[PDB]
């Protein structure tokens, strides 16, 4: 298998600044026919891949000329002359010199933006859920930066680790923030035995966590 090695992440890049992403192949991708079988693709969250560069340095149709590629035939570089917020996604190198054709593991491009505190909203279980014997307490933590965040749930003041389900968005293509959802799922029986429910977010924008809570009574 020809192995293409790429870093999993980029350092955060300031909006409007240049960036570079590298790929190293375990074998030269230049043919005897003079063709270099190296391609760069971009996949944005929830989208199909897009070709950016073909034959190491040729600009694909439909790709903006902010993108360029170069290399030695063994080592390759994708450059972005001025990064845009919409460029966030995973960049893959790929080869079709030899069978089987293979891809690099992809490099995530991250945009650096100003720090932003999460907007935190908490929601008790709906009546409809309770009727089915379930009780989910939902906490949304929206539009924060940077992505590093920790959420803690407390019931009657005591940390609960059980029954939590977390989900995170990719970096937003417009405002370059992140969002997260955390759901504490209890049974109605247990939910109705306690009173206070608390969602606590630890983020670099605050010494004390951001706390949202409610009382069942």
């Amino acid at each position: 298998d020809i192995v293409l090695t790429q870093a999993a992440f980029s350092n955060p890049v300031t909006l409007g600044a240049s960036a570079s992403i590298s790929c190293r192949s375990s074998k030269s991708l230049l043919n005897s026919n003079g063709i270099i079988h190296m391609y760069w693709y971009l996949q944005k969250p929830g989208q199909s891949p897009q070709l950016l560069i073909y034959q190491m340095s040729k600009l694909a149709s439909g790709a903006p000329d902010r993108f360029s590629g170069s290399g030695s035939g063994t080592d390759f570089t994708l450059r972005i002359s001025r990064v845009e917020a919409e460029d966030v996604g995973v960049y893959y190198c790929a080869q079709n010199l030899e069978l089987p054709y293979t891809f690099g593991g992809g490099t995530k491009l991250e945009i650096k933006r100003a720090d932003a505190a999460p907007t935190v909203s908490i929601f008790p279980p709906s009546s409809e859920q309770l009727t089915s014997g379930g009780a989910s307490v939902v906490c949304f933590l929206n539009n924060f930066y940077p992505k590093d965040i920790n959420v803690k749930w407390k019931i009657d003041g005591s940390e609960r680790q059980n029954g939590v389900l977390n989900s995170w968005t990719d970096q937003d293509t417009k405002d370059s923030t992140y969002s997260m959802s955390s759901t504490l799922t209890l049974t109605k029986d247990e939910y109705e035995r306690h009173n206070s429910y608390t969602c606590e977010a630890t983020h670099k924008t605050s010494t004390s966590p951001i706390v949202k809570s409610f009382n069942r009574n």
């Binding site: 929601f123 939902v138 929206n142 989900s167 969002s179 959802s181």
Partner: protein, 218 residues
């Protein structure tokens, strides 16, 4: 406009076979290679094989020997990929792509086909409204949401006001647990406009041929 239109989401039982398709238009079908790639949830890409409909010629990834077979119907400008002896390892989104020409890469891509390989039964989602009230929610903007719980398989489609509300929406990736998926979606609108301006989430689950609309009321 070159278009590659793939077949819809599949839920199939292990050990069976599935045949997914890619309908091409906008160019001479027989003049270009079409390829297929696999993307497992959270992972990279794996190349499966290429087919040249004017041949018919194929080039294949031997990692999939016996498992994948590529065909093309010149009469309908459709390429097919058949996957057999399925297991959960075959659960993935499969993409078809057109090769632009002489080693110029995959220039046009299909939208992908989600294949889930499982013994679990299809289950419609329960959709619960997330409304503020037990704690004045901030001051200029208000956040609402929907909790989509207990469905199988992926995917669901979430919109707000049938798609007319899109700014300020966050739909979170589903998480699987106990053989069922749970997803959440929030929407943030001006405080002065809810509830005067109604807000409703629409959750479509094509696998169960179910859609549910939940209006968010105070």
């Amino acid at each position: 406009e070159v278009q590659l239109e793939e077949s819809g989401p599949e839920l199939v039982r292990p050990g069976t076979s599935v045949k997914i398709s890619c309908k091409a238009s906008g160019y001479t079908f027989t003049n270009y290679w079409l390829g297929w790639v696999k993307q497992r949830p959270g992972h990279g890409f794996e190349w499966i094989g290429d087919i040249y409909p004017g041949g018919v010629y194929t080039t294949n990834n031997e990692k999939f020997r016996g498992k994948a077979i590529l065909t093309a119907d010149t009469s309908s400008s459709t390429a097919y990929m058949q996957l057999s002896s399925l297991t959960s390892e075959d659960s993935a989104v499969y993409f078809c792509a057109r090769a632009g020409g002489y080693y110029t890469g995959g220039d046009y891509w299909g939208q992908g086909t989600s294949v889930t390989v499982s013994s679990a039964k299809t289950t419609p989602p329960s959709v619960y409204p997330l409304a503020p009230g037990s704690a004045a929610q901030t001051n200029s903007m208000v956040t609402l949401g929907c909790l989509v719980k207990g469905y199988f398989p992926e995917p669901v489609t979430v919109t707000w006001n049938s798609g007319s509300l899109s700014s300020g929406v966050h739909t979170f990736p589903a998480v699987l647990q106990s053989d069922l998926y749970t997803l959440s979606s929030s929407v943030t609108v001006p405080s002065s406009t809810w509830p005067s301006e109604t807000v409703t989430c629409n959750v479509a689950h094509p696998a169960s041929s179910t859609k549910v609309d939940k209006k968010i009321v105070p």
